Amino acid sequence: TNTKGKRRGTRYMFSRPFRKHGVVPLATYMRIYKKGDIVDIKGMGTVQKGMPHKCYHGKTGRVYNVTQHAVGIVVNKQVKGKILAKRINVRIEHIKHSKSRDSFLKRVKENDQKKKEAKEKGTWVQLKRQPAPPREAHFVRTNGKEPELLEPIPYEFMA
Amino acid sequence: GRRPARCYRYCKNKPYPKSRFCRGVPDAKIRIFDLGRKKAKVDEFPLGGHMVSDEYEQLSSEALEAARICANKYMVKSCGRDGFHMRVRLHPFHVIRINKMLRLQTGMRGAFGKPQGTVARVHIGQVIMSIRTKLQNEEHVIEALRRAKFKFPGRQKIHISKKWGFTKFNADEFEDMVAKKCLIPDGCGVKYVPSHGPLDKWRVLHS
Amino acid sequence: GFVKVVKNKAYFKRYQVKFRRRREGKTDYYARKRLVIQDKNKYNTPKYRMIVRVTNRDIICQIAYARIEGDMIVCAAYAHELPKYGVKVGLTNYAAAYCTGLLLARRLLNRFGMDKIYEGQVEVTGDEYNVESIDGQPGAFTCYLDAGLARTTTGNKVFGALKGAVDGGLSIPHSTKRFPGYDSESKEFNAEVHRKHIMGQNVADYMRYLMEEDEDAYKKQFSQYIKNSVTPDMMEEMYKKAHAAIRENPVYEKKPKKEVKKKRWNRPKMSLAQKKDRVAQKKASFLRAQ
RNA sequence: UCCAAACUAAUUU
RNA sequence: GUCUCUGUGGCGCAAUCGGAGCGCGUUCGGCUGUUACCGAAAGGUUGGUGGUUCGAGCCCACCCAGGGACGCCA
RNA sequence: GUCUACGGCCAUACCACCCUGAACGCGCCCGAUCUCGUCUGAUCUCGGAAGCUAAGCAGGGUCGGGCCUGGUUAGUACUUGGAUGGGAGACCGCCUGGGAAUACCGGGUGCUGUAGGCUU
RNA sequence: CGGCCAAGCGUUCAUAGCGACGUCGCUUUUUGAUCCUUCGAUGUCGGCUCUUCCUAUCAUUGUGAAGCAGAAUUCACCAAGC
RNA sequence: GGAGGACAGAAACCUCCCGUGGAGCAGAAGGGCAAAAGCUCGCUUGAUCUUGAUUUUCAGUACGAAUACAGACCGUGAAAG
RNA sequence: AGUGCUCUGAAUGUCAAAGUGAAGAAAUUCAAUGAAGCGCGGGUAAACGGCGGGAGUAACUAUGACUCUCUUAAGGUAGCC
RNA sequence: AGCGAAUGAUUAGAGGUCUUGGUCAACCUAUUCUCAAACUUUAAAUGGGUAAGAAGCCCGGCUCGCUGGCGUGGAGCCGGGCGUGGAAUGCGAGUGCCUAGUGGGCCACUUUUGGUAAGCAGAACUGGCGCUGCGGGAUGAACCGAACGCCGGGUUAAGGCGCCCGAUGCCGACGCUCAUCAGACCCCAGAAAAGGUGUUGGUUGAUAUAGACAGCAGGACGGUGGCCAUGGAAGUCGGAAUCCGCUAAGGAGUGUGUAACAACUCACCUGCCGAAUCAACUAGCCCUGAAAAUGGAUGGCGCUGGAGCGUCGGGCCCAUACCCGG
């Protein structure tokens, strides 16, 4: 039976990358976390206060509370039969803004830019992105050359 | 006595080398890995014949030095005391274990065993043994490696390499690279001298 | 050789450099981490710090707040611009530290327009003073001191620029323990010893000392005061005339210059083509020499 | 009334 | 298998109290006609190998050479 | 063209060695009455301005070492799914999709924000 | 209980008879290992008696080999009739 | 580690140079750490008084331990803290 | 020596209830005083039971009368196997 | 994957030369062989999380005792305006109460731990058996196909189609193989190393009408026997040898087992014989290797121009599955 220790098996998870030891870069301290934005929870090893438990390393939740040094994140956790939402307090060394949301905020700012300018050209522009259609018909020039013949090579034995 | 060798033939356990953890292994039976005139240069002992395993298995250290011996005294007897250099290219690093039994605790209670010997885990295509000789002894290196096969459990193939000696450069291009100083013979092997670096090593190469 | 080289190839494959501004020896990232960083619930509020740096011939004083892009300087006041106000010389002593901190404050408060609201301590006592905010007005500009890598012992000139900035009207949390008039064995602050360091009286005494004992080292220690004719007995008023000239007109106006060409004063990088024929004619002229 | 044991095989009167 | 335990001068064996010894023997003077007694000197990888430590023969981990003790329903 | 102060990303920026550095600056530098420290004014602190780019620093250089980035390695190794595939086995082919790492061979050698200089 | 390889032994001579260092198997009369069956019970060692089966042959019939002169002996083959 | 310096040597102390952590941080191992989390000085008692929330084990109960706050009183520092 | 059993009871240490003394408004509390027993001291094995190791040594060898030693309450005697 | 990258483990030469090593090591530098569950610069496949709107977006204002240079910053509140519903595919969803039985499991593919192994012990992932019949595997909890109301018709799956036994009673296609223990279909119910001038393929190399190969043989071996030695030299050998025939090409011996001048004509041939041949590999089937006890098991009978093995075609046979119908 394994131990129920708080850092059991975090030999590589909470370690540091190679030649990225030492002083934390200072711009991880001057991000701004509003309430209700999506953060990625990772967890450094250089800072021991306020680190999340290992079951949250690599999860993603939204911010509900903001303190002097920390944050309150609502994270889904799949315990055995059901997913329940956990409220965890993490110092802000261990998190970062998630770019999974920001492509969606890139196109909501792109769609309102094109709905009040759609009508006067009679344009019904496409907004729903579609899942990669099959390739259309086209022509392929040989340019006078002929295609190179390929044939399998004989076997030989080295290693 | 040791167990019969079909007990420890297939690579079933994860590699268990001797370390801080597995203490007190017996020493391996094979201790000498190179043999013949070891101090022979690279310049004119050009043929290299290999022994390649066809199976994924593990070979005991008793059997590595049984084929060390039986291929030595054939090469001694027919290519002279110094007309060859053989090299065993497997080290017995994996440690096999034994569960000794029969006032201890009987049965499979406490079954993790004690270290008993060492084997070398070998793969498909992996070279077991190499011999370098004169070019006119191709008949005898094929015979000495054929007589070392009968000492090993699985299946092996005998193969004459395309490289020069124990080097990694093809024998078709070896003399041209020595001539144009792309290679430099130091000892048994050869140094590759690339076209980058500080230019004083170019100057001493072309003194 | 005989010894193992420590700086081999495997030494450099595993070497992590420190930060660019650490290995220049300019920034303490331990202190900066506690100084430029705002509480996360005071979200986009700035956190201003007064940056006092003393070179060998100048005193830089500037207020900055931190951004992800780099620090943003809001106001900066130098000490080599004090001869415009009438201090020709001694431009790095304790007195010009006060004048630079005073100039930095008054240049900031009219930049914001609060200059007549917060006047500061006009008559220099040298005693403890704190600007307190007035209800119904804008608050006092609250700022913190970044001494840097300086050893902050009692009498250090960075507290002179602090004392000038408090008297200029800024709100800087400080104590009087590191002003020059503090007495460590009594834990007592004088405010008259400290007042004379603002007026340059420690220098004025040493000028009168070298006049009456050496007179040849006097021309050596104070060769530029003699050229600008700065008598010891005219000096305390020479800063009083200077401080009022600061409060008269703290605005920094600057002159542009245009008539410059594109003269390379250094040397550009050699191209790849110039590099690999240079070796080709080194290899040629080596074989041609044998 | 303190303790106090032993003594060449090497021979010639 | 597991747990304790011993190892020290030629011999039996101390100190287990982190800061090298008894008895006997062996040399060597004496006494004696000549071989107990009297006097004095010498002698120790303190099993081995690493640890810990201000510091180890004393405390730790292992190896060895020895011992001892713990098991029974067929 | 370039520096200073404060930075951001933290080697394309580091290390060794050589060469050049106008003007500003930055430095080395000169001194110990005051402030403040020392076994020692060397460091630290303070007061200066005779000297100097020697060194730091900057720019350049090196068939340089590292580092960053491409090629090869290689559709290789491995791998998801599949078969009443093969083989005594160990293991191995094929189908269906994914897809690396050295050695080896090239290229590169800091970008940049805020404030303030200098360069005719 | 057998096989393969062949350093050696066999005055000479690897292999008549052998066979180190290796390595590949078979068998279920051993014992370990396991715990599938039986605890509303399968009488539990040996000897005695009696039958049948196996061959991995001790002898006998027919053979081959030898370091088989004869004699005795050893090694193999077909073979479990007796 | 190197090179030097009366006695002084394989080890005493002195000095310069190299030194990306190869040391140390009470202990097991793992992670972290260099104008530091190390070593040395100065001042101290935040090892104190409180009420909730959260995490970890998990039934998502308790203990234990731990993390963010908030209210007091305090220490230290020029100050940010 | 152990475990018992037994004798002795000296100033004996420990030691209950009652009794005595003091403190207190009282319940109560404290102190003094101390029976047997235990502890201390003898005796007792035809009581229960118990009754060692290690070295060296005779002039062929081998043995070991003798010698030295750690050691315990004694170290197994006459016998017998 | 890596180790000419740190930490460990480790093989060999080479180049340097300082010295408390005695030319040797040690040492250093550049290489080189082989490793790692409790090492790693690097680094997949499969995987884990979040997102893909009206609970949004854009406008104005208001509140605050929090924050504060500032009309700041933050949260809240109130109006007003915007539907192309902002990937695919499928689907009705939400929520409460009460509650039984269970808490001995076992098996299989892949990953995996202990063990020589086990129809052994212990995990992961999914499916199954337990709870479940049916067709197929002769027989079988678990394999393969497919899951079940009571029937008719049709058609399939896995598997089959000599006879048992439904279906090849095809003028089926091309080969391989002879076994005096043949072989014969997932799981699965029997074999290995090593061999075979057994046959059939293949790979590489070599010789050949300036005539090989195999067999008869025609001048068809000698001063030099040297050197090695009178334990083996004017035939032939357990130690280092090693030129020459006065030739058309020739021994200091493979060859008549040898202290012997013992003694016979191989070797190398140009005419005879006159056309192809030799060797080493390799892998198909078959054989040797291959021995246990009641008499016996491709299921049986049997089968050899196949009813065996390999690659294939057309038909055909039937499940409770699929389809149409009651």
Ligand SMILES: [K+]
């Ligand atoms: K019994």
Ligand SMILES: [Mg+2]
């Ligand atoms: Mg500081």
Ligand SMILES: [Mg+2]
């Ligand atoms: Mg002793």
Ligand SMILES: [Mg+2]
């Ligand atoms: Mg009993």
Ligand SMILES: [Mg+2]
């Ligand atoms: Mg100085």
Ligand SMILES: [Mg+2]
């Ligand atoms: Mg310079």
Ligand SMILES: [Mg+2]
């Ligand atoms: Mg210069």
Ligand SMILES: [Mg+2]
């Ligand atoms: Mg380079």
Ligand SMILES: [Mg+2]
């Ligand atoms: Mg012999």
Ligand SMILES: [Mg+2]
């Ligand atoms: Mg079981």
Ligand SMILES: [Mg+2]
């Ligand atoms: Mg019965």
Ligand SMILES: [Mg+2]
């Ligand atoms: Mg019966």
Ligand SMILES: [Mg+2]
């Ligand atoms: Mg037989």
Ligand SMILES: [Mg+2]
């Ligand atoms: Mg007796």
Ligand SMILES: [Mg+2]
């Ligand atoms: Mg059941």
Ligand SMILES: [Mg+2]
């Ligand atoms: Mg299937």
